[PDB]
Design a protein around this nucleic acid. Structure first.
Length: 107
DNA sequence: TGGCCCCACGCGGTGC
DNA sequence: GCACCGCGTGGGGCCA
C-alpha cells in the first residue's frame, strides 16, 4: 500500500475517463498538478508552457510528467472507445463506399 | 436560463 | 513572404 499522497495510476485513469479529449485531458492534468496556480489568486494567468509572450514558464518537470501520462496511460485507457467508435465505423465505411456518388450518378 | 467549461479561430509577432 | 506560435475572443454544449 503506497502513499495516499502520491498521484496514483488509478486517479490518472479516472481523469482520462473524465476528459473530453486528449487536449482536455492535458488541461485537467495541468489543474491537478498545478493547484497553486488555480487558486482564487489565479497565478495561472502569469504562465504558459514555454515562457513565451513575456510570461513565466510552467515547471518543465511537471509538464514532463503530464506528457508521460498522455503517452503511457491515456491511449491504453481510450483504446476500446477509439477502436469501437472511430476505427470500426471507418472500416465499414471504406467497405461500403460507392465508386460513384449518387448525386453524381444522377447528373 | 446563467454559470462553467471547452475549443475553434482570426490576429499580430517572430524567425527563417 | 509565409509557416509557425500563443493571445484574446466568442460560439455553443452541459446542467442544476
Amino acid at each position: 500500500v503506497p502513499s495516499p499522497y502520491l498521484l496514483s495510476d488509478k486517479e490518472v485513469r479516472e481523469i482520462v475517463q473524465q476528459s473530453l479529449s486528449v487536449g482536455n485531458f492535458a488541461a485537467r492534468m495541468l489543474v491537478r498538478l498545478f493547484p497553486e496556480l488555480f487558486t482564487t489568486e489565479n497565478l495561472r494567468l502569469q504562465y504558459n508552457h514555454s515562457g513565451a509572450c513575456n510570461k513565466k514558464q510552467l515547471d518543465p518537470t511537471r509538464l514532463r510528467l503530464i506528457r508521460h501520462y498522455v503517452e503511457a496511460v491515456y491511449p491504453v485507457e481510450k483504446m476500446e472507445e477509439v477502436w469501437h467508435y472511430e476505427c470500426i465505423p471507418s472500416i465499414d465505411e471504406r467497405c461500403r463506399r460507392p465508386n460513384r456518388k449518387k448525386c453524381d450518378i444522377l447528373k
